Amino acid sequence: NTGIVSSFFTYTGPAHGTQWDEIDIEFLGKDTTKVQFNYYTNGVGGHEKVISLGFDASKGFHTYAFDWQPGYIKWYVDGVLKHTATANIPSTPGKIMMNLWNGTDDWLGSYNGANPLYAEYDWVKYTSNQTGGSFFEPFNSYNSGTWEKADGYSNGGVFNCTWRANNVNFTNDGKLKLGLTSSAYNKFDCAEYRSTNIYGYGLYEVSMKPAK
Ligand SMILES: [Ca+2]
């Protein structure tokens, strides 16, 4: 069922001592000509919207964004509005997170570990509703002041891989590359990179290329 997923999302929930509020951009590796938008408010999801892109997202970098305001979320693809939600919008500030992971599946028919799956992200921009809360991250190198790598555990549940910090790497030309690897025992190691601060309403933009 759930195969390979590359994502850009905001998150907060009970490990952070709050209700689960989250806004998603996710790409399923089974069809990268589409993108899926969704969000959870107080743990309630069921807002999936799948958009056809008109291009195969895995072939180049595109800019995806969501503008999260008190009364709506609006999602954009390369500056073009694609979807607006207005119902039960979330309101708790969260961390910005990016991951690549496999669920518990037919993507294994083509998976070859000598040319592993990688999701690449060239930059992230957050333009805050609160003056002085904006930031730009170009992914030239690991910045321990603003981000952390997930390592040493699995989320469990739908996730069928263990986060490894050594699957989070930076290329010499400035991209964050998250990899999904398997060396034996049908065990996969995957990767998540996440901010250390939390952010609220504003425009979140990412330039990325999902795995396939
Ligand atoms: Ca960059």
Side-chain angles (χ1 to χ4, degrees), residues 1-104 106-212:
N1 192 299
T2 295
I4 294 312
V5 175
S6 305
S7 74
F8 176 77
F9 60 105
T10 39
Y11 175 87
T12 189
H16 298 97
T18 65
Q19 65 179 45
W20 173 12
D21 280 4
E22 161 173 354
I23 299 173
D24 287 324
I25 300 176
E26 278 181 298
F27 294 86
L28 314 197
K30 89 148 144 216
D31 189 349
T32 50
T33 63
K34 287 173 180 50
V35 62
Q36 186 174 278
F37 303 146
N38 199 5
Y39 61 97
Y40 291 84
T41 301
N42 198 193
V44 178
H47 308 113
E48 297 83 342
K49 172 67 186 198
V50 174
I51 293 289
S52 312
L53 299 168
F55 52 84
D56 184 330
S58 84
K59 300 281 208 284
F61 283 91
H62 293 262
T63 301
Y64 309 83
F66 48 84
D67 189 13
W68 176 19
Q69 291 299 323
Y72 64 70
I73 302 172
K74 283 171 184 190
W75 282 265
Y76 292 86
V77 176
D78 289 330
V80 183
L81 174 72
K82 298 309 305 178
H83 181 58
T84 307
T86 51
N88 192 205
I89 302 298
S91 70
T92 311
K95 286 178 190 209
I96 291 171
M97 299 205 182
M98 277 151 287
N99 58 24
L100 162 58
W101 62 277
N102 54 300
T104 137
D106 38 68
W107 60 280
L108 272 180
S110 54
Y111 179 75
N112 183 313
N115 116 290
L117 294 150
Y118 292 112
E120 294 177 29
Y121 302 80
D122 190 6
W123 48 263
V124 171
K125 189 156 115 182
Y126 162 62
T127 298
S128 184
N129 283 7
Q130 53 135 118
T131 342
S134 301
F135 77 97
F136 173 71
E137 167 62 55
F139 303 124
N140 286 332
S141 73
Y142 174 47
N143 192 346
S144 75
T146 42
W147 304 90
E148 49 195 354
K149 302 177 189 194
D151 183 50
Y153 71 96
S154 171
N155 282 359
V158 74
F159 291 86
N160 184 44
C161 56
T162 297
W163 305 123
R164 299 293 181 191
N166 52 267
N167 276 5
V168 178
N169 284 303
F170 289 82
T171 67
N172 280 305
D173 63 339
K175 291 143 195 183
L176 171 60
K177 196 151 193 175
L178 297 187
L180 195 141
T181 53
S182 180
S183 60
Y185 306 106
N186 210 18
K187 285 312 219 341
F188 285 87
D189 285 327
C190 53
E192 167 173 278
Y193 197 53
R194 43 183 195 230
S195 66
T196 53
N197 284 336
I198 56 179
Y199 301 94
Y201 304 136
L203 178 66
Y204 295 73
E205 291 176 278
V206 62
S207 172
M208 62 179 288
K209 182 163 75 128
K212 180 172 208 99

